[PDB]
């Protein structure tokens, strides 16, 4: 149980990630995570980015873990685990579209 359900849901795909995101009631900045069904079973970091000029939407950052290091949505910034990178991404965008699930969504 890395976090709980703010930036990570579990073993979800991009169809639900975009759904739950635009169907949960959370505001943009909701960087959800989930296992990628593209490979044997990698990870992912979906993100809700609705806008006041187009409607709601949801992008995604395929998460991958190198056995030579740890995790990384982009090869420019890896970490040791999903909780450790959600830790760095929380105080920093990490280089992607931005940080991860907002801490004070309220």
């Amino acid at each position: 149980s890395i976090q709980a359900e703010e930036w990570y849901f579990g073993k979800l795909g991009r169809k639900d990630a975009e759904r739950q995101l635009l169907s949960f009631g959370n505001p943009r900045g909701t960087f959800l995570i989930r296992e990628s069904e593209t490979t044997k079973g990698a990870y992912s970091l979906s993100i809700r980015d609705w806008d006041d000029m187009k409607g709601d939407h949801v992008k995604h950052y395929k998460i991958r873990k190198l056995d030579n290091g740890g995790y990384y949505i982009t090869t420019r910034a890896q970490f040791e685990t999903l909780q450790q990178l959600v830790q760095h991404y929380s105080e920093r965008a990490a280089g992607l579209s931005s940080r991860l699930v907002v801490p004070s969504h309220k």
Binding site: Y61, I73, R76, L96
Partner: peptide, 11 residues
């Protein structure tokens, strides 16, 4: 870009 977005893209 195709596939998941990637921070890097230039050469």
């Amino acid at each position: 870009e195709p596939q998941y977005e990637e921070i890097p893209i230039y050469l």
